Enzyme design. Sequence first.
Site, PDB file in Angstrom:
ATOM      1  N   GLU A   1       0.217  -1.415   0.062  1.00  0.00           N
ATOM      2  CA  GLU A   1       0.232   0.166   0.063  1.00  0.00           C
ATOM      3  C   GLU A   1       0.414   1.151  -0.346  1.00  0.00           C
ATOM      4  O   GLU A   1       1.843   1.079   0.426  1.00  0.00           O
ATOM      5  CB  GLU A   1      -1.162  -0.055   1.177  1.00  0.00           C
ATOM      6  CG  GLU A   1      -2.351  -0.622   0.996  1.00  0.00           C
ATOM      7  CD  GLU A   1      -3.151   0.465   0.585  1.00  0.00           C
ATOM      8  OE1 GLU A   1      -2.284   2.412  -0.034  1.00  0.00           O
ATOM      9  OE2 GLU A   1      -4.400   0.677   0.806  1.00  0.00           O
TER      10      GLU A   1
ATOM     11  N   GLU B   1      -0.839  -4.772   6.557  1.00  0.00           N
ATOM     12  CA  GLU B   1      -1.019  -6.358   7.034  1.00  0.00           C
ATOM     13  C   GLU B   1      -0.321  -7.508   7.246  1.00  0.00           C
ATOM     14  O   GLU B   1      -0.449  -8.362   7.688  1.00  0.00           O
ATOM     15  CB  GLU B   1      -1.789  -6.902   5.755  1.00  0.00           C
ATOM     16  CG  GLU B   1      -3.051  -6.065   5.155  1.00  0.00           C
ATOM     17  CD  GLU B   1      -4.613  -6.702   4.244  1.00  0.00           C
ATOM     18  OE1 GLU B   1      -4.091  -5.661   3.315  1.00  0.00           O
ATOM     19  OE2 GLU B   1      -4.627  -7.201   4.493  1.00  0.00           O
TER      20      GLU B   1
ATOM     21  N   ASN C   1      -6.426   4.864   6.386  1.00  0.00           N
ATOM     22  CA  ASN C   1      -6.287   4.450   5.597  1.00  0.00           C
ATOM     23  C   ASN C   1      -5.608   5.278   3.849  1.00  0.00           C
ATOM     24  O   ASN C   1      -4.872   4.964   3.605  1.00  0.00           O
ATOM     25  CB  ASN C   1      -7.353   3.975   4.480  1.00  0.00           C
ATOM     26  CG  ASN C   1      -7.221   2.777   3.921  1.00  0.00           C
ATOM     27  OD1 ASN C   1      -6.457   2.942   2.475  1.00  0.00           O
ATOM     28  ND2 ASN C   1      -6.761   1.303   4.479  1.00  0.00           N
TER      29      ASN C   1
ATOM     30  N   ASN D   1     -11.979   5.357   0.647  1.00  0.00           N
ATOM     31  CA  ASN D   1     -10.330   4.589   0.702  1.00  0.00           C
ATOM     32  C   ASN D   1     -10.389   5.454   0.348  1.00  0.00           C
ATOM     33  O   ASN D   1      -9.039   6.520   0.851  1.00  0.00           O
ATOM     34  CB  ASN D   1     -10.964   3.582   0.092  1.00  0.00           C
ATOM     35  CG  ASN D   1      -9.515   2.461   0.369  1.00  0.00           C
ATOM     36  OD1 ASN D   1      -8.886   3.847   0.322  1.00  0.00           O
ATOM     37  ND2 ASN D   1      -9.823   1.154  -0.413  1.00  0.00           N
TER      38      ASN D   1
ATOM     39  N   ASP E   1      -9.991   1.779  -4.677  1.00  0.00           N
ATOM     40  CA  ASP E   1      -8.356   2.230  -3.704  1.00  0.00           C
ATOM     41  C   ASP E   1      -8.281   2.801  -3.433  1.00  0.00           C
ATOM     42  O   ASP E   1      -8.611   4.557  -3.193  1.00  0.00           O
ATOM     43  CB  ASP E   1      -8.493   1.187  -3.921  1.00  0.00           C
ATOM     44  CG  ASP E   1      -7.208   0.451  -2.141  1.00  0.00           C
ATOM     45  OD1 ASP E   1      -7.156   0.940  -1.536  1.00  0.00           O
ATOM     46  OD2 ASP E   1      -6.950  -0.943  -1.961  1.00  0.00           O
TER      47      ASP E   1
ATOM     48  N   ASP F   1      -4.917   8.619  -8.136  1.00  0.00           N
ATOM     49  CA  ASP F   1      -4.149   9.846  -8.476  1.00  0.00           C
ATOM     50  C   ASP F   1      -5.075  10.196  -9.758  1.00  0.00           C
ATOM     51  O   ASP F   1      -5.091   9.413 -10.994  1.00  0.00           O
ATOM     52  CB  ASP F   1      -2.726   9.756  -8.180  1.00  0.00           C
ATOM     53  CG  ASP F   1      -1.887   9.500  -7.370  1.00  0.00           C
ATOM     54  OD1 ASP F   1      -2.139  10.775  -6.097  1.00  0.00           O
ATOM     55  OD2 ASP F   1      -1.104   9.107  -6.497  1.00  0.00           O
TER      56      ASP F   1
ATOM     57  N   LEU G   1      -1.302   3.468  -5.672  1.00  0.00           N
ATOM     58  CA  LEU G   1      -0.830   4.045  -6.861  1.00  0.00           C
ATOM     59  C   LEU G   1       0.332   4.885  -6.783  1.00  0.00           C
ATOM     60  O   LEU G   1      -0.471   6.310  -6.324  1.00  0.00           O
ATOM     61  CB  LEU G   1      -1.005   3.728  -8.322  1.00  0.00           C
ATOM     62  CG  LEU G   1      -2.259   4.832  -8.449  1.00  0.00           C
ATOM     63  CD1 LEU G   1      -2.054   5.841  -9.252  1.00  0.00           C
ATOM     64  CD2 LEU G   1      -3.524   3.882  -9.920  1.00  0.00           C
ATOM     65  N   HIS G   2       1.156   5.508  -7.568  1.00  0.00           N
ATOM     66  CA  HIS G   2       1.905   7.064  -7.188  1.00  0.00           C
ATOM     67  C   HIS G   2       3.619   6.750  -8.674  1.00  0.00           C
ATOM     68  O   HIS G   2       3.553   5.692  -8.762  1.00  0.00           O
ATOM     69  CB  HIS G   2       2.770   6.607  -6.146  1.00  0.00           C
ATOM     70  CG  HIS G   2       2.514   8.283  -5.326  1.00  0.00           C
ATOM     71  ND1 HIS G   2       1.528   8.990  -4.728  1.00  0.00           N
ATOM     72  CD2 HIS G   2       3.569   8.777  -5.365  1.00  0.00           C
ATOM     73  CE1 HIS G   2       1.899   9.738  -4.434  1.00  0.00           C
ATOM     74  NE2 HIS G   2       3.361  10.149  -4.164  1.00  0.00           N
TER      75      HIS G   2
ATOM     76  N   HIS H   1      -2.499  -6.794  -4.129  1.00  0.00           N
ATOM     77  CA  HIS H   1      -2.740  -7.783  -3.103  1.00  0.00           C
ATOM     78  C   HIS H   1      -2.972  -9.258  -3.632  1.00  0.00           C
ATOM     79  O   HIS H   1      -3.421 -10.321  -2.634  1.00  0.00           O
ATOM     80  CB  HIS H   1      -3.314  -7.678  -2.378  1.00  0.00           C
ATOM     81  CG  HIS H   1      -3.547  -5.839  -1.380  1.00  0.00           C
ATOM     82  ND1 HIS H   1      -4.277  -5.657  -1.193  1.00  0.00           N
ATOM     83  CD2 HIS H   1      -2.188  -4.633  -2.280  1.00  0.00           C
ATOM     84  CE1 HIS H   1      -3.961  -3.857  -0.837  1.00  0.00           C
ATOM     85  NE2 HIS H   1      -3.088  -4.044  -0.985  1.00  0.00           N
TER      86      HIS H   1
HETATM   87 CA   LIG Z   1      -0.569   7.427  -4.754  1.00  0.00          CA
HETATM   88 CA   LIG Z   2      -6.275   2.256   0.222  1.00  0.00          CA
END
Ligand SMILES: [Ca+2]
Ligand SMILES: [Ca+2]
Length: 314
Positions: free
Chosen positions: A21, A37, A120, A175, A229, A232, A273-274, A287
């Site tokens: 994450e 997790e 989150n 989220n 989830d 961006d 994502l980024h 995941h």
């Molecule tokens: Ca991001």
């Molecule tokens: Ca998330």
Amino acid sequence: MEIPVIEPLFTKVTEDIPGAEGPVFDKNGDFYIVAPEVEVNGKPAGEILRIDLKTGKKTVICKPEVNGYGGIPAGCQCDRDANQLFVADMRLGLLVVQTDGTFEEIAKKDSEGRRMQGCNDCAFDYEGNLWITAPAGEVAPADYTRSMQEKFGSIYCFTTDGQMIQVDTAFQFPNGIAVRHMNDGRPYQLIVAETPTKKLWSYDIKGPAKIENKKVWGHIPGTHEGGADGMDFDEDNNLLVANWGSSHIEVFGPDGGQPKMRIRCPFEKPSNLHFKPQTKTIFVTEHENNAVWKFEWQRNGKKQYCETLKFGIF
Ligand SMILES: [Ca+2]
Ligand SMILES: [Ca+2]
């Protein structure tokens, strides 16, 4: 289709990160991931990792715990004025994490004296206010709960003057979150994912911690378990949204509605994502394999707050 689908090459970055994450770059261009997790004896023991992009090797910089309660760190943003990470944690609320691995917990309670909820994801606007999703119930030491079934998830804004302000409530698992800016830099729209309901919500941002005009802005395809989830913007203000369970990242145009394009991933559960600064490269956590990948998008990302200048001119 229509909806058109693209199938870019995904390159592996790193592996074996439970609940991988919160991908983020710091002001030095170092790359970090969170592992919410990770558990030890069935209790949370989540981690914040630095990834060496050349090798894929992982280093755990922080394994946060407060009074023995382990964290579930799940989402990140880099600060602008200091090279420090703001980390949304499902047990501990909002953390500020240094590169040396030390950390501080920012709020046990909100500005109205209500117990903080576990968080989150988060998004800085260009004014330095931090918009945060809080899909968990109360922070540790309260028994852990999350709003996947029932509508008790909240939204916060942590302001430049240090206030942790609850700005909405009653979401079913808020989220991902993102802020749209005018070309001049002014923040003006907040987008919030509500995972299981297959919705993206919008608000007008009227000022720091001031949102109004709540609207069902976008619709996430599919009836799989999961939904939107992380998200961006790209530099043209298209919103890229991981649709966990669908095998796709959705691409919304500036006006929302239905996706204009989808990106097929070689896995079922894209999470977050980024962009890498100054590039078209998107890092994606997922995941299915609990792993991190990268692919090339059509254009560069929208600059994050940490890429802007306090003492800029233009
Ligand atoms: Ca991001
Ligand atoms: Ca998330």
